[PDB]
Design a protein around this ligand. Structure first.
Ligand SMILES: CC(=O)N[C@@H]1[C@@H](O)[C@H](O)[C@@H](CO)O[C@@H]1O
Ligand SMILES: CC(=O)N[C@@H]1[C@@H](O)[C@H](O)[C@@H](CO)O[C@@H]1O
Ligand SMILES: CC(=O)N[C@@H]1[C@@H](O)[C@H](O)[C@@H](CO)O[C@@H]1O
Lengths: 165, 165
């Protein structure tokens, strides 16, 4: 019956819906208040230096104060994670599986994850016996066909390297 | 069994994991490629004026070209949805259940959702008998104890107004 959070296999709710302490999605104090696991919690979840490095769920910004949210107070000056307004440098893996572009910035989409992607959720990174025994980054699995990724297709049967099986 | 997407009751994957066309979470072409439903799809999902006004899942930015991603190319100049680097005004709902602050900016966290929150995922917006008949915004439900929210706790038993079931 569960939808989200520790009860629901770590799933997130769509459209910033809060995951309650009990593992269901909604808005209002029952969901977003005490025990809120993810989504638009109020107050925001604790993040960054103020929670042992933990990033914000649902790609929220981590404020200078170490709360999760959106707006200039969270993403602007002093932002310490999520889609901060500042460019995010890498080369230092990108947080939360963001791609590190060939030019050393974090992002998602083909400019980051496509040609020249260094690490993170690259579109098409080759590995294993199809790529000279090359390893995957980010502790991803090498799939049977010698592509990097995660999930059963890469970590399951035929997995060559990384956290197989 | 299913984790995400249409098969998984609309759930998102954590940490920008792609939801495959079959409703499981992963990375690599099988998850992020053709039929990717959410997460760090490659290419990015279509969005905004190239997708009938659909917003990006997982609070990705919608680029001026109508793709979902992160980085300056997506959130910077031309950004048409998600956590764009530009401040977002409201007064005129916010997208994606973001709170419209008392000052007329969209965001999440207490500065937006707390005291003076006009609409969206407000922390504690009063409604119903306890608020002299006041209506919720966003087509939220007014719960039994007179707060605005969504989910079973608000739309279910005791729901006073909005789309009660
Ligand atoms: C794909 C990539 O890494 N692009 C970056 C861009 O995100 C960043 O804003 C800019 C800063 O000068 O440098 C590059 O163009
Ligand atoms: C395309 C898609 O649904 N991929 C899933 C994969 O994520 C999952 O972990 C595995 C176990 O069922 O096999 C599937 O095909
Ligand atoms: C809580 C709130 O609405 N704060 C906004 C801030 O997010 C925005 O960047 C600024 C623009 O001038 O106006 C206010 O300070």
């Amino acid at each position: 019956a569960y939808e989200c959070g520790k009860q629901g296999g770590g799933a997130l709710c769509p459209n910033n819906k809060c995951c309650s302490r009990y593992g269901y999605c909604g808005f209002g104090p029952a969901y977003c208040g005490t025990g809120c696991q993810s989504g638009g919690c109020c107050p925001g979840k604790r993040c960054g230096d103020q929670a042992n490095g933990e990033t914000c769920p649902n790609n929220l910004c981590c404020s200078e104060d170490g709360y999760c949210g959106f707006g200039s107070e969270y993403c602007g000056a002093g932002c310490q994670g999520g889609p901060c307004r500042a460019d995010k440098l890498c080369g230092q893996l990108c947080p939360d599986n963001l791609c590190c572009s060939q030019w050393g910035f974090c992002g998602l989409g083909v400019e980051f994850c496509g040609d020249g992607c260094q690490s993170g959720a690259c579109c098409s990174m080759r590995c294993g016996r199809q790529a000279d025994g090359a390893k995957c980054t980010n502790n991803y699995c090498c799939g049977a066909s010698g592509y990097c990724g995660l999930g059963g297709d890469y970590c399951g049967a035929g997995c060559q390297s990384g956290p197989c099986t």
